[PDB]
């Protein structure tokens, strides 16, 4: 069963993707 | 109509605009119907019956089939 | 048989269909009576039904499981009546019409008013030209080998 810690870890990873996505978008602009 | 569709689909029938929930009755029309029903003998003294049984009256049947009947108005 | 089908003469479903159809009409006729015009009509209709099924039975048509006739068109001459033979008829008639039409258009093209003769046909000429289409196959081939049918890049074309 996916533990809370596991879910929280996933969310942290997603955040990294988001910040790296904004940059790519702003670099393409 | 769209409101009602959404409500019935979401399992919330008590929130629909229906005669069993929030109701939107045609009060004005219901009133005129009564006026026309009671006209014979009053506002139309020499008449003997309603111009139409739609406004009100009895059910006229011919051959076991209904010819005309009072038509009621609701939500 | 071809495709696992069965000859209609030997298909039980086909016969069942026949019996059922006739029964329906007969049941209707029962209501009417004797020589009543309605009854006589229904009676005549059953005769036609019986005839149709019989014709198909005597034919070479192949029926399927539903008891309905299925047509074969792979080129076999065993079942040529189904498509090949009727097909020739269409080609002959269609070519006739097309050939005669082209002939008339080309014929009236050199007239005083080539556009009035398209809205108001010259019946006498048309009839003459129409009768000359029975030999369209021969005429067409002759025109092809005489370089009189197909044109040669002297026709309008698009910009590109």
């Amino acid at each position: 069963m996916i533990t809370d810690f596991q879910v929280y870890i996933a969310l942290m990873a997603a955040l990294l993707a988001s910040v790296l996505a904004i940059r790519l978008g702003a670099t393409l602009y | 109509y769209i409101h009602n569709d959404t409500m019935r689909a979401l399992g919330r029938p008590q929130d629909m605009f229906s005669d069993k929930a929030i109701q939107l009755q045609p009060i004005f029309a219901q009133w005129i119907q009564n006026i026309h029903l009671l006209a014979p003998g009053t506002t139309a003294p020499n008449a003997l019956a309603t111009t139409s049984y739609a406004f009100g009256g009895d059910v006229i049947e011919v051959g076991g089939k209904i010819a005309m009947m009072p038509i009621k108005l609701g939500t | 048989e071809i495709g696992g089908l069965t000859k209609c003469s030997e298909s039980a479903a086909f016969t069942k269909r026949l019996n059922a159809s006739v029964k329906k009409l007969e049941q209707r006729a029962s209501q009417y009576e004797a020589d009543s015009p309605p009854a006589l009509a229904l009676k005549q209709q059953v005769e036609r039904t019986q005839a149709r099924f019989d014709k198909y039975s005597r034919s070479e048509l192949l029926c399927g499981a539903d008891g309905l006739p299925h047509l074969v068109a792979d080129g076999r001459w065993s079942h040529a009546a189904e498509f090949i033979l009727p097909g020739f008829g269409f080609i002959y008639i269609s070519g006739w019409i097309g050939w005669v039409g082209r002939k008339y258009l080309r014929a009236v093209s050199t007239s005083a008013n080539p556009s009035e003769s398209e809205i108001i046909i010259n019946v006498p000429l048309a009839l003459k030209i129409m009768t000359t289409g029975y030999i369209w196959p021969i005429s067409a081939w002759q025109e092809l080998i005489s370089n009189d049918l197909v044109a040669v890049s002297e026709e309008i074309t698009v910009s590109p």
């Binding site: - | - | 005839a51 034919s59 009727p86 809205i119 108001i120």
Partner: protein
Amino acid sequence: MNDFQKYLSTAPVLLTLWMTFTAGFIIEVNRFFPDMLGLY
């Protein structure tokens, strides 16, 4: 007469007559040779 014949020679009129004739002959064929799905 000549003028009337021209009117009768107009495209619309001729089409109707021709199609009526064609339709009629097809109907008549089916009346005498009915129910055919193949040349027998």
